[PDB]
Amino acid sequence: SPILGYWKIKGLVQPTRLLLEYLEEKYEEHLYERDEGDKWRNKKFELGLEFPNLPYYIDGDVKLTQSMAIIRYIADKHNMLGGCPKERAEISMLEGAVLDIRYGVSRIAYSKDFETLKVDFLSKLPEMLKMFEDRLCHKTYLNGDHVTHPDFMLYDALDVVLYMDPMCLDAFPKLVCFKKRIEAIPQIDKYLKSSKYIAWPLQGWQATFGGGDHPP
């Protein structure tokens, strides 16, 4: 049974967690609580990781770090990255654009000047969301009729930008849909209602946005 190690927050591993639950693939988590920053530094180097860091994935001497290398791995272990250069690169471009939103959030989330920075993020956000609304025109999931990992990435992003601005999607009902659709997938839906689901925080507890032990 593979092992996924990370903070007990959505952060950088939420997409991955979904994917795993989607493929009903069994695994165990090493969850680091808010006040366990030591326990980690205690094991940071006794895991045999070539690039100690969080999150980490480990099973039969497959030692990985870097949320993207990880997620892609689980994906690849199930032939889901693409069937050729073109479709593989298309799926990577989705990866990129989704992170340009998920990350946009986190880089201005730990700032003490969040409350005035989000304003310029939310103004740009439309143009970013739009591109996804189009991609989703005549398609069920990005990149086709079959679910890919970037669909779980966009879902996390969406879920996170809605906390920042409950109305960011009203102008994109096609995304509001895509979101309910994902939540409809039996495995996923069963998960969100399960005990293993980490509802909060979104970022590191210290973060201004999506921080704190419980949502406001």
> Whole-angstrom Cα distance, residue 152 to residue 125?
19
3-state secondary structure of 99: helix
Binding residues for glutathione are 6-7, 40-44, 53-54, 66-67
Q: Which residues pair with 3 in a beta bridge?
A: 28, 58
Residues in binding site for substrate? 110
Q: ∠ at Cα 213 (210, 216), nearest 5°?
A: 55
How many C-beta atoms surround the C-beta of residue 3 within 10 A? 13
H-only helix segments in the chain = 14-22, 37-43, 67-76, 85-107, 114-135, 149-164, 173-184, 186-192
Binding site, residues? 6-7, 40-44, 53-54, 66-67, 110
28-32 vs 56-58, strand pairing mode: unpaired
